[PDB]
């Protein structure tokens, strides 16, 4: 036995509110964490 | 009743920024100047 002790963790979620929206209700494809993408987008061409 | 007034200038420009750039690879969905139209549609939705 290691102990009978335990340090668990509370939820985790993703709401569509930034652009997730203009995406689902105008295109089809809502990328789930899509903001860190989509600026990683506009960064990697630049490098 | 000669010799008017036009633009010179070709009208205008449409490229695929981030706003469409990430709309358009991600998903494969493209939308017409998103900036105003996802600004405009995110302001009604609060309205």
């Given at each position: 036995?290691?102990?009978?002790?335990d340090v668990?963790?509370?939820y985790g979620?993703?709401?569509?509110?930034?652009?997730n929206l203009?995406?689902?209700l105008v295109?089809?494809?809502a990328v789930?964490?899509?903001d860190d993408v989509g600026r990683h987008l506009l960064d990697m061409?630049?490098?």
């Open positions: 036995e290691d102990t009978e002790a668990p963790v509370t979620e993703m709401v569509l509110n930034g652009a203009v995406t689902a295109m089809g494809k789930r964490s899509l061409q630049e490098e």
